[PDB]
Write a protein that binds this ligand. Sequence first.
Ligand code: NI
Length: 179
Amino acid sequence: MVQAWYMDESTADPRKPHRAQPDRPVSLEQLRTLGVLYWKLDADKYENDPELEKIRKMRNYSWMDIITICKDTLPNYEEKIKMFFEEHLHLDEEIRYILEGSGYFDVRDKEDKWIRISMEKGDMITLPAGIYHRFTLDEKNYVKAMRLFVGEPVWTPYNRPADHFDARVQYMSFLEGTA
Ligand code: NI
């Protein structure tokens, strides 16, 4: 089952797990209060999976592509990696389905504390527009993921502070309505 936790207070080595001590696990239910949704799929079937198709149709994820993040293949790797880990939001959902490898999506909770979400092969996550988040590889330094989008993609991050945007205002308003 998918693992998430509150993070420790170290600012060193972002690819390490950084589990708070004592452990403070976070459930899928708590993640849903933040608008973060999750599905488990068989990643070997990704090119032809009726279960993925059900999700995509339901959620209007009409666009997809495949990205591989690793030292060798990725162009402008060191720069991209730096940017992905800067705390930011998007004006649209961020949807990723992990096909091989793994990494961490960190998201802010309702008290603005960091939760780290460990994503592995078969895990699919959507982070809602307006949520402050960031991404890093873990210590294995490799991920292959499908990126999905509602319509034609815009990837632009807005590094925090990005509080003026309507997407952020609406996300905040969503947060008042959950547990
Ligand atoms: Ni992002």
